Amino acid sequence: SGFRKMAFPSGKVEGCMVQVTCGTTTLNGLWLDDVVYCPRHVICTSEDMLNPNYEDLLIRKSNHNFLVQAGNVQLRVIGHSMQNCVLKLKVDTANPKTPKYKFVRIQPGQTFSVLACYNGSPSGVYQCAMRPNFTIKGSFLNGSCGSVGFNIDYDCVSFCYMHHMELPTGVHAGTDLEGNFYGPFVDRQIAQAAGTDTTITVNVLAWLYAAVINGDRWFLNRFTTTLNDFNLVAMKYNYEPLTQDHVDILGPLSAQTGIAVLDMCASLKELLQNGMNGRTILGSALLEDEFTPFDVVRQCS
Amino acid sequence: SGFRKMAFPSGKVEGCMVQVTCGTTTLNGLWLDDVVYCPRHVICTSEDMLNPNYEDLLIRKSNHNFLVQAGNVQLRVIGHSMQNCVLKLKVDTANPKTPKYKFVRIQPGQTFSVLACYNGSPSGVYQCAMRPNFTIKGSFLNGSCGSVGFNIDYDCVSFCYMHHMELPTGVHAGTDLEGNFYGPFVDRQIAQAAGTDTTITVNVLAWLYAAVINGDRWFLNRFTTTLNDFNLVAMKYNYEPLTQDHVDILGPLSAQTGIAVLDMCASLKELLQNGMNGRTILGSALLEDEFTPFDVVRQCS
């Protein structure tokens, strides 16, 4: 028993992290096979980041302008291209620690693990959710760009995120591994506004089920609600609308606990209108929304 | 910017996990050099666990009663010894992935990463504090015994915890790698209970400092307080007394923020006396006590 924000073991991803230096810009890169993927803004200078023309800055570069360091071993850049916002550096050595991997684009509401790296060396591992407004609430300092977010399935690492920037509000933004930003952001050093964020309702419900599975039952009630009457309340508190597809995905958790999804919705509705009144759920005084139904099942039983 | 509960990169510990089987009991072991460490209750059967004499159970065992798997490869047990509640199984192969490592016993209030494992396979990683009552609030299912807690310092993995059991309140109990329990618990299926817990004051202060470092000041005030005057409010709120040694350890954070320790204590005092009035700190509606001062400095720098 017990319930914790839990990351995937990071070994397979640690063996893929390298340092990429171009001029006096150093960030992290992902060495898979004979390719190193990194944020394209590594080619920019301090004054170039204000509003760069990347196709121009890149045509003025050659292989020898990219210093790639794998621990101490300097890798030789023998090629390069640009795919949207990522640089792909062809190198002479294929990464021997390369795991079974995929590149995937995750949906808002899904979670993943982040290996925070600086100068090519892992610093720590933590879980994030892709917020509905396509930002993530990370922990990223100068030098952390090129850090990846990922999930593991069987022995396969599905890379889903590469870090590029921090917004003025302090949340974080980046791309999938094909270089397309999550959300309406660009890799230019200019203030950019995230859309208004909202709470991931299906995740809150899963976490309430995790709580019941762990013996937290004070918030249950005998009332029930319609899906429509529930979404009317969620709208008021800035919660994502709940669809039948979400209701269907909570099926397993509803079955394990014997609590109908709409009954749990009645619980959530009560919690929203009245707060918790000094009580907690799995150690939080807030309604947690960074646990998917999958995250709940994986950790409960 | 940003502040997350962050685990150490776990790759060096994944390489040390193995499966250990005796009878029909299976749990995890820690393979370092030619020794596999695991909980001794792996030699117990269903009936044994109620009231076992481990010396008497172990004399009755042969090396070949122990099945150890490192991935696909069976490892041959060539010796065995019992040290307190831990079993040391000598094997015919030194772990080639053995990292620089030490065994240490941690103090109440310190933190470590847990690599949750099942059938010798890493499952996830998260951060824990050793509570003042010598339990941890972990996430552990059947099969997880032998999972280890650790910190990393430069190249050295310091192992500090091995998982053995769950208490009735849903918290977790275990030993150091010498097999000596943390807290007054025993590895048998009898009724036992955690002592009364308290909040780790020094850590709450470390976290308030992280909140200021990351740009948040709403909870500060113009007041101040003497150590004794602070500790009188602490005792009333079930917080550990704050010592001058805690104050000294909080020095560097005090210096980076320009906020005197005792001034942050008056802030905490006001927070305890008033609550938070619907506001949050680093995304929590509760005062977080599972970050040490070292955790803050490490993540914020």
Ligand SMILES: *[C@H](O)[C@H](C[C@@H]1CCNC1=O)NC(=O)[C@H](CC(C)C)NC(=O)OCc1ccccc1
């Ligand atoms: C990449 O290493 C870095 C990550 C930022 C810096 C601090 N925390 C992060 O997540 N990225 C940048 O500096 C990035 C480069 C542009 C060409 C997009 N720009 C950025 O994030 O600027 C905003 C900012 C910079 C420094 C501190 C706070 C915000």
Ligand SMILES: *[C@H](O)[C@H](C[C@@H]1CCNC1=O)NC(=O)[C@H](CC(C)C)NC(=O)OCc1ccccc1
């Ligand atoms: C070892 O794999 C296991 C870990 C427990 C299982 C549930 N969560 C954990 O942390 N340890 C035991 O089952 C332990 C065996 C003794 C003879 C040392 N007893 C134990 O934890 O008893 C309480 C319990 C067992 C099963 C489910 C819930 C609580």
